[PDB]
Amino acid sequence: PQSFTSIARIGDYILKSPVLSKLCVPVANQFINLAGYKKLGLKFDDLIAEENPIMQTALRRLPEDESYARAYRIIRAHQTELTHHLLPRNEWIKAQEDVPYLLPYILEAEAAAKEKDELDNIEVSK
Amino acid sequence: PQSFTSIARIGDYILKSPVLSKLCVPVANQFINLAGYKKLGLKFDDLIAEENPIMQTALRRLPEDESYARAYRIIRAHQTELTHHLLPRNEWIKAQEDVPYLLPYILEAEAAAKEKDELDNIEVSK
Amino acid sequence: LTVSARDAPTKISTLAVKVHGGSRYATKDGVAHLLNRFNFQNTNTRSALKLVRESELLGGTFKSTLDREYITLKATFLKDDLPYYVNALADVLYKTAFKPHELTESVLPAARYDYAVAEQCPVKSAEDQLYAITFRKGLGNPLLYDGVERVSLQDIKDFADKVYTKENLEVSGENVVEADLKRFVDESLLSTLPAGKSLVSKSEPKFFLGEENRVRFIGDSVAAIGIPVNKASLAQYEVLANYLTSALSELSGLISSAKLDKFTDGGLFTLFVRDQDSAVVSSNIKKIVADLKKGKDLSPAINYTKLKNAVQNESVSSPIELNFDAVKDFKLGKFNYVAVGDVSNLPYLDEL
Amino acid sequence: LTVSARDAPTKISTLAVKVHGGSRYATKDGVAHLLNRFNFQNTNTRSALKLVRESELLGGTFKSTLDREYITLKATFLKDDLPYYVNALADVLYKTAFKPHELTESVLPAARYDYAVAEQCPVKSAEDQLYAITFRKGLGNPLLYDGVERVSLQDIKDFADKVYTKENLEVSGENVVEADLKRFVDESLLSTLPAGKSLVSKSEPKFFLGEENRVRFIGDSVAAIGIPVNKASLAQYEVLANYLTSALSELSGLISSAKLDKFTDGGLFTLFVRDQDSAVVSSNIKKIVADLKKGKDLSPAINYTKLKNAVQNESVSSPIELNFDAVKDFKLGKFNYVAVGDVSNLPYLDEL
Amino acid sequence: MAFRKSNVYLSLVNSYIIDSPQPSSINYWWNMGSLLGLCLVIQIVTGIFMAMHYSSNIELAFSSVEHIMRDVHNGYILRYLHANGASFFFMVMFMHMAKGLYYGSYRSPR
Amino acid sequence: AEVTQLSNGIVVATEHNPSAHTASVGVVFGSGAANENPYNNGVSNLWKNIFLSKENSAVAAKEGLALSSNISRDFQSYIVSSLPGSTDKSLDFLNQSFIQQKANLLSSSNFEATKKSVLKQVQDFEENDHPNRVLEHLHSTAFQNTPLSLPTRGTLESLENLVVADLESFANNHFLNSNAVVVGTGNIKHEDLVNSIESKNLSLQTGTKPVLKKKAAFLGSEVRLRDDTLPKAWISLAVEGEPVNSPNYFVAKLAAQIFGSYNAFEPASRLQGIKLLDNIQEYQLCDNFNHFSLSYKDSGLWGFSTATRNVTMIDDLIHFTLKQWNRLTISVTDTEVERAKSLLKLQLGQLYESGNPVNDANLLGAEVLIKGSKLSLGEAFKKIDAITVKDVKAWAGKRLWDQDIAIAGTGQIEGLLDYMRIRSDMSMMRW
Ligand code: HEM
């Protein structure tokens, strides 16, 4: 419901400014570590809702190895929440490997769709 | 509901004995031209119900010319029953061209399915 | 009609009828494959269902295979059911029904399946292309029907009563006594076949040398060489086959397969190198022919090829008794070539 | 970069960029067709959607086609929008994005469709088989990608970096001024290309004569003969083509189509006779070569092929001016042959 | 194919309550819909077997309810099942709605 | 006619078929791919390919021999087939290059090349041989954590850490003389064979192979290696069957032959006497299936292995063939019993009598290793025709009614419903 270019421009304006970064990035790190999606063995790019067309194109444009690892991480999250346990301490997703592997694909897909809807409502000189 | 081998057996026994033939075929000819399926431009073997497996295989084994002529006769009967008329006197199916064309395929298909039914209910001597 | 059987003190017998009706004698191509897939079907007396079910109750198995020369009709049964299977093979040789409704329903999907299976292997395509470039329209008709030349039902009927004649076929078998088999082949409807002409002609079938074909194919690449051989030089090339695909050579790791197809009149020695990469096919077939163009000594492979030909002529009914002791050496002359697959990265006949 | 065009006081212009990157210069086979289908995809600045919709609003169209030698990028526009289309062709030559998601979604289905279309027609199959048996790995690479050699995005990127260089291409145009087009090919992104090596070879491409290919095909039967011609014998075979597919000969009722494909080195004169029937194609191509092996008069065809050469040369702007007056007679020598379709009823090379 | 997938009513019952593919990780909050269906059937059944005795005048409404409570056989059971299953119906419905607006099943595909 | 004699060490078993040509002498050991731990696995296949290597096969081919080998789940065999007048050459070759010193076979050039070729062909088997690998995964999950669970070819992860020390330890621990049986098929007489084994002294060792601690126990399990790249869906489910030297062995093979094997594209296998082919032939629910009955030394399997291109109706195929399995216990007829009796006699005759004298050598070596003497083709036929319908019903109530199954699948098998439905569709409520 919120396009990722909006979140990207807000987040890049927060990160590249000095006075906001070191005062909002520690509370963001503590919020991510308090959310507890890493204890189920999940990066954040599995958590994103998929029933957009943008996420469908971004998941069909994924490479064929990251797609297999993503399907395994989702299935392991399903099973280890089915057992109402957590993954052991050796299989938690560490903070060094929560890289965005899907966000460049979603940014290029939403930029393509935004350019398409911008071109469909164009106005020539009247 | 009634197998065509039984109809063919009773009909052959009525036909090829000369006492019953000259008594049974004139009332049969009068019953056929009183029925009125020839005024719509139809042979008889279009009238048979096509929703048995025997009739479905007997239609899929039909040759390519008689299948197209059969489809045209069925569609023309549909249309001239829709307009609540009859076909004109030139386009009535004459009695000499009311040839049974589907009946050998029906007889051999029901003979094959019948032989399957009594081959899988067979018993060796015990 | 030559009845040639032998006895053994065992339980399971086989009865086979071999006709000379492969794609050597097909008028249109793919007609022999349609007749071979057509064989054990509806007779004018009983069905293809009644025959299969009552023979399974009697304990046997029908089969019909097809190679370049023969059509083989085999029946494997328990030993005390000989006259029923003799009468069944005579029934199916005489009076098959030949209906269009079973031509389209049962014969053509089986032919399409067998053609797709033999197409998806890249070595059978090279083998029949090697046949088609060695012998043009003798043995070089394609083995299987593929929808190129449209075959009717009337062509199948004409070919069937051309080939299913009494002087053409002969009946063999394992674990049957010859007296009861010769007494059951007579008092039958195998003796009342039309006594047509035998179809084999015994002079050598006019080969062509120094010809190349290049077939484009997605998958794995093969390169095949093929030498048409006479009847006198059959032993030397049989020793060469059992020497090349054996541990006596250093060329066994390169050659994936090598075999001599034998016939009455002559044969064809074929050699396939298959890989998934294609520079290895190029270097392998270059090494193979560049080492075979020098003289190889074939006398160490004589006892081994006597073993291999005893064990391969074990169960066939057509034993050719080759001598294998006038063999001393081999030097390759001219040879047909076919390259299937990644065809631009494969060497030509001038490069070999 | 030799940009040179011509002018005429009219409305609709075109501007073409011819690079030397056809199937002749492809490293792997099927690379050039994938680059040609990859041509008008998204660049690094603007997309392939914005370019199409914005150029439709500005009144023009793009195209990208591929012969055996050239890849030509064409733009047809209204005359008052020259520098936009020059900058669009410069951007699409310089900075195509080369995305794998644009490889598998948008380019591979188009290449699959075009290969299926050019494969379901038996004349193009005969033509490329005749090319591939005349010239082996030079001009005779296959024109379209079929998947036999697996090529992915890195080979397409390296081939585009090899062929999209400055001294390789030429720039043509109709209904543009020459001075401001020369000013607009500068001030641009086309002069900042790497000044790479030219790709055209001056040697004549080493043909092979007397070779025959026979490819099995479902549908119509095509017999095609093919003669590689030099640069001195170009006029004689051009007037032979325009004498054979004309009313002057007795043979245009038999010959479906005959054409001479010209190049800077030499050329290839191909002759296709096709039908549903195969004995018709047999007797036809036998009559064609049995009459062409005698001497044919080529004197009444001279003015007619001057007409046909003018109507064929005004379309392109790389005209090879033949003088057409040193031609007297024709006598056929050695020729390559290809038979597509119902092959077992088609004549072989020593039967002709 | 099977008769539970071929027959038209049994194909509906099959595709809804037999082999309808449910996600593998749903907890006990997703059973509230089955509970609401059961309790709706309970309300309808006890309501019919009370409306066979309830007369809806102004002189006979409360008197007929206390006639159900006192004289008909096991009528106290029926009236307390209706009047308490309505409260349990609304509490399981509130749990259904709160699960739906907590787990984000108001979102884009439903 | 299948004579067996115990010598000083070894047991000699032979059968003399005087009409066959190639007489075939070899030794068959009773230690297959279920007599080791899962870490040295594939040492049996590695020994087979060491014996079949270029050095050994060139030495055997210069003299006129042709080597053979076959590794199975309790017996492994080494067969030197030969011409009938030349079997003392076979015997002293098998003595001089397998039973005595093997230092020509076990140096690190031939062993390195053999190990590399074995690694390549095992990974080519794992990728590109799909029904055999799911029968192997069925064996690996049915008898798991128990020595019958092992792969025959060996796994890749437990084959790259094998050296000549493993092969020498296995040849010291399992290539014994109270574990070996020498066999002769083809046309050698019995007494010239033992005369040539007792003239030249042939004895491998003296000791006894180590006995296992854990017997083969079935564990009802499930596994799925779903690779949706593949075009088909190869699944195979199986229950615990009766082992060898069990009284309910031939009734297990007969109950397999009741349902037979099928092939959807051949027009002569679509007309068989199976009741399942009137359920799986109107929507074409499968391409082939074959009901095996494997009987190893301690236990064995019983089930069917299929392949399906119609990957949406997998559960219907499973449900239909499992209802046909319950028809064995409740209402099996007698015409199915007699059809399977004649077809089982035909199949065992096609297995025991054939042209190749090395398959007879392997079968004779196995059933003389486990039993002690070979029962003939006549006694097997008598034990087959002594089977009534009530024996099949008793065995089917014993081993097929509501028993634990083990499933192994690959390909597009999401349409395969998961385990408890397949387990509790092995027992119906009496219709
Ligand atoms: C949606 C489901 C239903 C709900 C939530 C519901 C709720 C209620 C409630 C709260 C009452 C008042 C009980 C009291 O006095 O405290 C009531 C009364 C009543 N309901 Fe329903 N009802 C439902 C369905 C039905 C249906 C379908 C019928 C008819 C068949 C019915 C018949 C009655 C009757 C007769 C009364 C009269 C008073 C009594 O005897 O309880 N109900 N209902």
Curated annotation (Swiss-Prot), chains A, B:
It holds the Pfam family UCR_14kD. Its main location: mitochondrion. It is a peripheral membrane protein. One of its GO terms (biological process) is proton transmembrane transport. Keywords: Electron transport, Membrane, Mitochondrion, Mitochondrion inner membrane, Respiratory chain, Transport. It is found in: Mitochondrion inner membrane. Belongs to the UQCRB/QCR7 family. Component of the ubiquinol-cytochrome c oxidoreductase, a multisubunit transmembrane complex that is part of the mitochondrial electron transport chain which drives oxidative phosphorylation. GO terms for cellular component: matrix side of mitochondrial inner membrane; mitochondrial inner membrane; mitochondrion; respiratory chain complex III. InterPro entries: QCR7 (IPR003197), QCR7_sf (IPR036544). Component of the ubiquinol-cytochrome c oxidoreductase (cytochrome b-c1 complex, complex III, CIII), a multisubunit enzyme composed of 10 subunits. The complex is composed of 3 respiratory subunits cytochrome b (COB), cytochrome c1 (CYT1) and Rieske protein (RIP1), 2 core protein subunits COR1 and QCR2, and 5 low-molecular weight protein subunits QCR6, QCR7, QCR8, QCR9 and QCR10. Present with 10100 molecules/cell in log phase SD medium. This is Cytochrome b-c1 complex subunit 7, mitochondrial.
Curated annotation (Swiss-Prot), chains C, D:
The modification Phosphoserine is found at S125, S152. GO terms for biological process: aerobic respiration; cellular respiration; mitochondrial electron transport, ubiquinol to cytochrome c; proteolysis; proton transmembrane transport. It is a peripheral membrane protein. Its main location: mitochondrion. GO terms for cellular component: mitochondrial crista; mitochondrial inner membrane; mitochondrion; respiratory chain complex III. InterPro entries: Metalloenz_LuxS/M16, MPP/UQCRC_Complex, Pept_M16_N, Pept_M16_Zn_BS. It is found in: Mitochondrion inner membrane. GO terms for molecular function: metal ion binding; metalloendopeptidase activity. Present with 35700 molecules/cell in log phase SD medium. Component of the ubiquinol-cytochrome c oxidoreductase, a multisubunit transmembrane complex that is part of the mitochondrial electron transport chain which drives oxidative phosphorylation. Belongs to the peptidase M16 family. UQCRC2/QCR2 subfamily. Component of the ubiquinol-cytochrome c oxidoreductase (cytochrome b-c1 complex, complex III, CIII), a multisubunit enzyme composed of 10 subunits. The complex is composed of 3 respiratory subunits cytochrome b (COB), cytochrome c1 (CYT1) and Rieske protein (RIP1), 2 core protein subunits COR1 and QCR2, and 5 low-molecular weight protein subunits QCR6, QCR7, QCR8, QCR9 and QCR10. This is Cytochrome b-c1 complex subunit 2, mitochondrial. It comes from Saccharomyces cerevisiae (strain ATCC 204508 / S288c). The gene is QCR2.
Curated annotation (Swiss-Prot), chain E:
Residues 52-74 are mitochondrial intermembrane. Residues 1-27, 103-110 are mitochondrial matrix. This is Cytochrome b. Heme b b562 binds at H82. It comes from the Eukaryota. Heme 1 (or BL or b562) is low-potential and absorbs at about 562 nm, and heme 2 (or BH or b566) is high-potential and absorbs at about 566 nm. Belongs to the cytochrome b family. The gene is COB. A ubiquinone binds at Y16. It comes from Saccharomyces cerevisiae (strain ATCC 204508 / S288c) (Baker's yeast). Heme b b566 binds at H96. Component of the ubiquinol-cytochrome c oxidoreductase, a multisubunit transmembrane complex that is part of the mitochondrial electron transport chain which drives oxidative phosphorylation. Component of the ubiquinol-cytochrome c oxidoreductase (cytochrome b-c1 complex, complex III, CIII), a multisubunit enzyme composed of 10 subunits. The complex is composed of 3 respiratory subunits cytochrome b (COB), cytochrome c1 (CYT1) and Rieske protein (RIP1), 2 core protein subunits COR1 and QCR2, and 5 low-molecular weight protein subunits QCR6, QCR7, QCR8, QCR9 and QCR10. It is found in: Mitochondrion inner membrane. The chain crosses the membrane at residues 28-51, 75-102.
From Swiss-Prot, chain F:
One of its GO terms (molecular function) is metalloendopeptidase activity. Pfam families: Peptidase_M16, Peptidase_M16_C. One of its GO terms (cellular component) is mitochondrial inner membrane. SUPFAM superfamilies: LuxS/MPP-like metallohydrolase. It is found in: Mitochondrion inner membrane. GO terms for biological process: aerobic respiration; cellular respiration; mitochondrial electron transport, ubiquinol to cytochrome c; protein processing involved in protein targeting to mitochondrion; proton transmembrane transport. Coiled coil: none annotated. Keywords: Electron transport, Membrane, Mitochondrion, Mitochondrion inner membrane, Respiratory chain, Transit peptide, Transport. It is a peripheral membrane protein. Present with 19300 molecules/cell in log phase SD medium. Belongs to the peptidase M16 family. UQCRC1/QCR1 subfamily. Component of the ubiquinol-cytochrome c oxidoreductase (cytochrome b-c1 complex, complex III, CIII), a multisubunit enzyme composed of 10 subunits. The complex is composed of 3 respiratory subunits cytochrome b (COB), cytochrome c1 (CYT1) and Rieske protein (RIP1), 2 core protein subunits COR1 and QCR2, and 5 low-molecular weight protein subunits QCR6, QCR7, QCR8, QCR9 and QCR10. Component of the ubiquinol-cytochrome c oxidoreductase, a multisubunit transmembrane complex that is part of the mitochondrial electron transport chain which drives oxidative phosphorylation. This is Cytochrome b-c1 complex subunit 1, mitochondrial. The gene is COR1.
